[PDB]
Amino acid sequence: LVHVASVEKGRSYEDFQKVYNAIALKLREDDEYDNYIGYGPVLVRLAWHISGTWDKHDNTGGSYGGTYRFKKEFNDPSNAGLQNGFKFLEPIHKEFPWISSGDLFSLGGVTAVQEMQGPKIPWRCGRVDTPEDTTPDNGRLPDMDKDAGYVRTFFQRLNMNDREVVALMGAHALGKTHLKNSGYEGPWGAANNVFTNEFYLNLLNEDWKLEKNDANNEQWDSKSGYMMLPTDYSLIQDPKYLSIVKEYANDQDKFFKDFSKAFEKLLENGITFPKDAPSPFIFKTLEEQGL
Numbered sequence: 001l002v003h004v005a006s007v008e009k010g011r012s013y014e015d016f017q018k019v020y021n022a023i024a025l026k027l028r029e030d031d032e033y034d035n036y037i038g039y040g041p042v043l044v045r046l047a048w049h050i051s052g053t054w055d056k057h058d059n060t061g062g063s064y065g066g067t068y069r070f071k072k073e074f075n076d077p078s079n080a081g082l083q084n085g086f087k088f089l090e091p092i093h094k095e096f097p098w099i100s101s102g103d104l105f106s107l108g109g110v111t112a113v114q115e116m117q118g119p120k121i122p123w124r125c126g127r128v129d130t131p132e133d134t135t136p137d138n139g140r141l142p143d144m145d146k147d148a149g150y151v152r153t154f155f156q157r158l159n160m161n162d163r164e165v166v167a168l169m170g171a172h173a174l175g176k177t178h179l180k181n182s183g184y185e186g187p188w189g190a191a192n193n194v195f196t197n198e199f200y201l202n203l204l205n206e207d208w209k210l211e212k213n214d215a216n217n218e219q220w221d222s223k224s225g226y227m228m229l230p231t232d233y234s235l236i237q238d239p240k241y242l243s244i245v246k247e248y249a250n251d252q253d254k255f256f257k258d259f260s261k262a263f264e265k266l267l268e269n270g271i272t273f274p275k276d277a278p279s280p281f282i283f284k285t286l287e288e289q290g291l
């Protein structure tokens, strides 16, 4: 497969900045969701899960096609709970019917990180909706009950190296696990809708204990009331991962710059951009615009 990026006809930066503004204003308004965490976290999880289906070997899956809109993908066990993020974006898609689904799902993730005080994420438009038969089969997204070797091998299919995987995983500072969606329960930290390097500091500074939860799965729990998945805890068990965790725990700016590069790469995997295509857009926040 080749997936060539095609700009929505006649649209420029100013049109996309209006879609960003609509998502950001609604994030401000629906602040009570999930005990006042807000929709910011489920929106960056949605942008990662529509992108994380990509296979570098045959160029299938990934964000281009907007195939989460189809039943097979939408009903994947690994996507349980993302329906909330889908329902959030739906009124926004009726308002701007010209934007492709893959561009809207990915822009939601960008908007959420920047409005939660994260780094600026350069974004490119141009994903094109593809038919229901291009929808990837279930089972391409990662298990949680595994170790650091599984994590490295899994992220190689998306061709992410060690630094990219550890930067990407720092998004677990946001939101929480939900027992009814995944069989795991708890937040990774205290400030869970503000984007910071807190995930790394908790992983190094808390006294983690391995326990079984009410779904019979194992997780690491701390005295503070936080948790870590076996796959998160992996990052301090592997020697290569652990040096990078320490680096981000001591330098949030370096974490912001590497998360920015890795997240853009994740959202663009599988897509060819022509030389004539616009440069990446850097959207202004509501605050930079006085809105």
Ligand code: HEM
Pocket: 041, 042, 044, 045, 048, 080, 081, 142, 143, 144, 151, 168, 169, 171, 172, 174, 175, 176, 177, 178, 179, 180, 181, 182, 183, 184, 229, 231
């Ligand atoms: C080996 C990798 C990963 C695994 C196994 C994994 C697994 C999970 C699980 C089990 C949840 C909780 C779901 C629920 O019950 O609602 C979760 C949540 C989340 N994930 Fe990950 N994760 C991984 C990677 C990532 C990456 C790469 C990102 C983003 C760049 C990410 C962002 C999020 C966010 C923001 C949430 C919170 C969602 C909410 O609060 O509803 N995750 N993850």
